[PDB]
Amino acid sequence: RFLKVKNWETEVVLTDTLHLKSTLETGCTEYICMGSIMHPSQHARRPEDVATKDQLFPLAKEFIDQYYSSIKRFGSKAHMERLEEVNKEIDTTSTYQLKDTELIYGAKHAWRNASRCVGRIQWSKLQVFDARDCTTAHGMFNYICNHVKYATNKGNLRSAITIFPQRTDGKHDFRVWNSQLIRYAGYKQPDGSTLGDPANVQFTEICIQQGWKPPRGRFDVLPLLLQANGNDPELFQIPPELVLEVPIRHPKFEWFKDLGLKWYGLPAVSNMLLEIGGLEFSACPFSGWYMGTEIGVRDYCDNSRYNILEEVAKKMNLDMRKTSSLWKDQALVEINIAVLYSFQSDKVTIVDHHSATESFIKHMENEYRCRGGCPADWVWIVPPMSGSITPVFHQEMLNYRLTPSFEYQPDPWNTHVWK
C-alpha cells in the first residue's frame, strides 16, 4: 500500500509512496529475499537487440512523459510534438535521439535513482559532457582526457559524466574496456603471488596481450582500452599530468610514508550502462570523489586486493597470532586515518564515512519530503568499517528500481568478436 521506514536511533518514521512508480523486478519474492545478491535480476526493459516499435516506443513515451511532467508541462504543445517526433524517428530509424535537456535530465536522475550510492545528496550538481558525436577510439580518448581534466580540477573534484553514442544493433557498441578510467595494474607473478593490484590482474593481462609494455611496478596506471562503433579496442596512455595522485602518509606514524604507498584521486566508473527511455548508453564514464573507506578498507585490505594489512600490523608491533587481539581492526583504522590525512593535506577532495553517511540521512529526509521516497540499498550504503557507529546502520531502507538508471553489463571481452 504505502510503506514506512523507521530510524531506530532517532525514531523518525518516513512514508514511501515513490516505490509505486517502480517498474523492474528486484529479484525478491514474498518468499525469498535477494538483497545480498550482487546481480539479483535480469529483468530488462527491452529485449536482445534492436527492438520493434511496440517495444521501444512505450518506454520512450514513459520517459518523455516523465520529463515533461518534471518541468510542469505534460500535455503542452512541446510535449505532444515531442511524442510525434519520437514516433516518426522510431518509424524511420528504429531508435530515437535525446534532446540535450532530456539527456541532462536523464543522467542526473540515473544518479538520483542509484540505490547503492551514498553520495547522492549531490545528484543535481553533475556536469554532463555530450559525446554523442564521437566516431573513433581516438575521439573517445580525447573526450576522456577532457573529462579527467575537468573532473580533477587540480584536486577540487567535480562530478561529471561523458556520454558516448547509444547502442544501435548491439554490434556497434561503444565501450570503455577499463572498469575505471584510472586503475593500477596487477601482475601475475611466477612464484604464484601477485604484484600491484590483484583485482586488475585479468585486465592488466588483456592490455599486455594487446601490446601494452608494462613497466611492472606496483603503481602502474593502466592504459585506456577504448572501443568505438564495435571495432577492435585500441590502447591509449593517459598523460600522467592528468592523473592526480596522493602519497599516503600518517599524521603520527612517521614510518608510514616509508611504505611507499599512493593512490589516485579520481574514481571514475567506466563499465556501467546508462539507460534512458529505452536507450542504452554502453559507454558513459562517470566520476565523483572518494569516500575514504573505498581506498583504505577495500582497495588496500580485501584479501584478493592489496592486503598490506599485515605489514601495517607488523610495523605497529601487534600480536598477529590470534584474531581476538583485533590486530586487523587496529591496522584498518590507522590506514583509514592515513588515507584521509593525506588527501586533506594535499587539498584533494575526500569524504569520511561519518560525514558521507550523515549527508545521506539528510538526503533521505529531503527525498521523502519532496519526492515521496528514496530507493536505498542498506547492504551497500552502510560503510565497510565501523558500521554501527554511523547513522545509516540504524536506518531502515526500501530498495526498488526506478528509471532512468545505471545498469551492469557484461565485460566486453566475453562478448567481442574480433577482426
Next chain:
Amino acid sequence: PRFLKVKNWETEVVLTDTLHLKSTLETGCTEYICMGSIMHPVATKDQLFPLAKEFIDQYYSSIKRFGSKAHMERLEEVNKEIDTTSTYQLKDTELIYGAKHAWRNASRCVGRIQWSKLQVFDARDCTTAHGMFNYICNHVKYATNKGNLRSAITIFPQRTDGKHDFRVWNSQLIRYAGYKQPDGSTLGDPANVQFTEICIQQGWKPPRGRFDVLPLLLQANGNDPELFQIPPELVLEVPIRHPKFEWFKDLGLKWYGLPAVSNMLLEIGGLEFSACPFSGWYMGTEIGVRDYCDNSRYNILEEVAKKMNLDMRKTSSLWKDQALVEINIAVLYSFQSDKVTIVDHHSATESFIKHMENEYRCRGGCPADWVWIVPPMSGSITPVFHQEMLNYRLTPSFEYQPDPWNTHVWK
C-alpha cells in the same frame, strides 16, 4: 527455479540452494520492492491441521521414518487431539527437534554452527511464576557452568486461547538497570530504562547503582507478572580491563557473561511457545560495539577517546573508530582472562562460512540475513561480507512478539 546460486566474491565458491523451495511463509519483500533492512516487516482447528502435518512429516523425514507405521499413527493421534481439544501436545523428541531446528533456521544468527548442541529443558508442566523462577535459575546455573558456557533453552507451556500466556517480561534473563535522572542524564544501561520503570512500579526497590542486575518479571497462565531476584551467586560477571591501557579498569566497567534472550516466541508445528528463554555465549562486538558504543548506550566511546588523547574535534580523525576498536579489544581480553566463553567476530564469521557451506552440502541450503550476519564493525575484513546469502523463513522458527505490557489485561 529449481535452483538458486549464491556466490562468494572473495573465494569464487558457488553454492546451489534448493532448500528455499520449502519456505512457506513471507519475508516481507515483494517482487518489486526489497525490505531486507526493515526490522519487523490463535489458530483455528482447520488452520492447525496442515501446520501440524507439515511439522510431523518433517520430523519423521529427519529420522528416516517417513511413511512408516509410527509416522502414520502419530499423524492420526495428532488430528484426534486437534479435533477434540483444538490443540495438541508435542512428544519430547519432537520438542527437542523443534527447538534445535528453530535455531538452525534463524537466518539472523551467525552462531548456528553450534545448533545441534542445544540443551533443551522441558518446562511444560510449569503452572506458576514461582515455578518459572525455579526453572529459569536452573537454566542460568546450567548454561553458565562457571564460565564454560553451554547453550540451552527452557520451554514453558504453549499458548492456548491467548488469554493464559506464559511470558518472561524481561528481554534478556540478565540485564542491567537504566535510570533516567532529573537533569536528563542516565545512570546504568540506557537501553533498559523503560523496563526498569516497569519493575520499580511493580514494587522493585532499585539500588540505583550503575550495574544493578534487573529482577525477573515472570507471568504464568496469563496472571499478573511477579518479581523475583536472581541469586547473585548465579550471575557470572566480568570486570572489563585493557591489556595495554592501565587506566581502562578505572572506568569501573563490567558485563555479564551469559546472553539469554527471553522475549521471543518459539513456533513448532503451529504451536506457539510464548515463553522460551534461550542462551548461548557472546560475540565480543555485541558488548563492545553495541552494549557500550551505540549513542543510545553507555557512551564510554567519548570517555575512552578522551583518555586516549584523541582529536575529537573532527570526525575525519576517526577517533570514534579508534576508540571502538580498543573497547572491543578490552572486552575480549577480559573474558578470555577470566576464562569466560566469548568469540570474536573474526572467528565467528569464519565458523559461520564453514557452517553455511556444510548446510548447503547436507541440507540443500542455509537461510541467512547478511544485514545481521555481517558484524557491526570491520565488516569487509570478515569473510561473510563477500558472501552472497539467500534469506527465507523456515519453520520451526523464533519469532518476534509484542512486549507483554502493551497487551496485558491487568487483574
